[PDB]
């Protein structure tokens, strides 16, 4: 009953993923390149999209870029070959919500797709008032972050992360807690998605040129706090 | 401003490159050896790296090797020497080179070219291109000859990919410099001819037929026969 659009230009992989997800309980639509992805996404509006990065015609990065420019927040998990790192990172930066490296076992994708759906248009936060951490203001309801009055341009998943960290300002959250609260994971994962997104957030928070607000507590977790 | 990391163990040269590139409109990071180069590259994600070859602690060839081994496709222009007539940094995976001594205008032109290429979002509609025994998987950035992987550096593939996309077309040195290297300017560099050599040698390793042809005074063509 959730509709998942799966996009890959490798016809074996696409057929396999189609088979795998349909059997796992999803209504599945497919596309072979990013143009067909955007057509499919536009004409059918999937609940989630599984999106290969390196494709002809329009790549996965472009597809993501395009969706997000249209304010289309559909959850997206990008797929990439192992070696195609600085590149899957591009999809995440451009606005994908999660990634999975090939080859993967099908359970890894199903689990992340159910998480994607659990956390589509998101946060597990109750704050209504804007949250201040030094010069940073995190407006959860208005989905707006500002540092010294200047908006910080964040993707939907960067913002969800910052929002969870602001909701628990000054508290340390572990990778595992952040996978559950932000990504909606209900399973143990081998993933550095939290680390990658902490990198992006911190770079954005610091681009102005002042204090580190977002701290890595080695072996324990991450914390948003002034000083 | 594009961020360029410059790496040279000679502090005079390092300082001079830094000054020059900054006055040319670049945001410049520096590193004194290959170890500092790796740290800077990780901590600071430069848009391009100007990389000396002979350095203590860790050399330019080792830097390029480590970067490529770690799937970091950052543009690298190596500052290298030229005997063997080999340019070891290129073979290791650097994208272009300059031979010291050089004028700054040559480095600036080459760094802009690096950046032009890395900045390109042009996406081909081609999938796998077949030329006789050779298959070029464009989107997958893989080549195989008679089903056997040909291990190519990023820039070797870039060149192979342009030749395959225009398969059987003769592309001049000038067009490949523009198309593959991102040059917008004159350049008397031999970099295209050097990489053609690399590809031939790699493509022809399995004993097979010549697929990459040099038409002197005209250009280069990838075709079976
Ligand atoms: Ca692909
Ligand atoms: Ca040196």
UniProtKB/Swiss-Prot annotation, chain A:
User: Residues where 4-aspartylphosphate occurs?
Assistant: 52
Q: A GO molecular-function term, please?
A: transcription cis-regulatory region binding
Q: Kindly give the CDD domains that the UniProt entry links to this protein.
A: REC_OmpR_PrrA-like (cd17627), trans_reg_C (cd00383)
Q: Tell me a GO biological process for this protein.
A: regulation of DNA-templated transcription
Ranges for domain Response regulatory come to: 3-117
| SMART domains membership | REC, Trans_reg_C
Main localization of the protein described in the UniProt heading: cytoplasm
Name of the gene encoding the protein in the UniProt record = prrA
PANTHER family reported in the protein's UniProt record = REGULATOR OF RPOS
Database matches in InterPro entries? CheY-like_superfamily, OmpR/PhoB-type_DNA-bd, Sig_transdc_resp-reg_receiver, WalR-like, WH-like_DNA-bd_sf
> Do you know which SUPFAM superfamilies this protein is assigned to?
CheY-like
Give a Gene Ontology cellular component term annotated to this protein: protein-DNA complex
Q: What is this protein called?
A: Transcriptional regulatory protein PrrA
The source organism is Mycobacterium bovis (strain ATCC BAA-935 / AF2122/97)
Summarize the protein's role.
Member of the two-component regulatory system PrrB/PrrA that is involved specifically in early intracellular multiplication of Mycobacterium and is essential for its viability. Upon phosphorylation by PrrB, functions as a transcription regulator by direct binding to promoter regions of target genes to positively regulate their expression. Autoregulates its own expression.
DNA-binding span(s): 128-226
Q: List the disulfide bonds.
A: none
Under PROSITE patterns, the record lists: OMPR_PHOB, RESPONSE_REGULATORY
**PTM section of the record:** Phosphorylated by PrrB at Asp-52.
